[model samples]
Target: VLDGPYQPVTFKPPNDYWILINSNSNGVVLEGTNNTDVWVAIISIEPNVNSESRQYSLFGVNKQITVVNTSNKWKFMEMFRNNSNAEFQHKRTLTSSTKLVGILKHGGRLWTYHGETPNATTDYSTTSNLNEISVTTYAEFYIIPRSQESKCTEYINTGL
Candidate 1:
């Protein structure tokens, strides 16, 4: 067998398109201050690259920012410099055509805060001192899927 999974064809994002991110059932919001557009191109990526049943999207311990097409200028701003938030936000549907599936399988934007893009040489693992309001003292995200409504907002497991 090969050392890795079969590679899917990687596709480029469309021009003039901004990313759309949403949580399921929970009311989490990923916000940015001023013009802190989401510069995420490789936030959540799966290890396997082939024969997957469902696609994957990247989540951020950081802001739920989506890079705007007008400019990647936001990347120039201090990493996490401006105000940003990644709280649980709910959505109606999670739909994707076969083509979209292929794109994601090949490392594409399911919503944009994800990809197979490369991390930077110098500033890759860096973060900002932006305000982070934790509902819990330890966790960075509002963990827990919406199915368990009580679990979504409360400390249920791993007990923080």
Candidate 2:
């Protein structure tokens, strides 16, 4: 019945803001020898040196991250705020992601990469040569913040 100062609860949310509009995805097809689960790492805009955030951001806002595997495919999806309590989920239906509403200074980036055999670690490369098959997906960002107030600088300018 007594809940005072929460330990390590940590202060969340930032001053800046961005919106992520939900839309349909084109889906990625990774064909290889193993044909097992593929590892998809969305390159962070901030570009951390050691520890990195698996979550991709819109503008500068860090979204609630979700990763799922459909058969042999991997979906790096983001769950955005719908109202105050509800959130939107990405189901690979190619419908629409939470619409990104923006009133900020800048936005961010997410250079994508893929690897075979499903390694959660950063086996990231500046390549998309997945099993020799082209992986095409649709992504649209908005209000993406490129400036920072109290968070990492990469949260600003291209998140790029």
TM-score of each: 0.18, 0.20
Candidate number achieving the greatest TM-score relative to the actual structure: 2
As a whole number from 0 to 100, the lDDT of residue 32 in candidate 1 is 29
For each candidate, what is the lDDT?
0.22, 0.25
Choose the strongest candidate by lDDT: 2
lDDT by residue for model 1 (39-150), tens: 2222221222333232223233433433222221111111222123543232111121110111011112122121211221112212242122111011022222223323
lDDT of 1: 0.22
* Cα RMSD for candidates in order: 19.0, 18.8
Sequence-dependent TM-score of model 1: 0.18
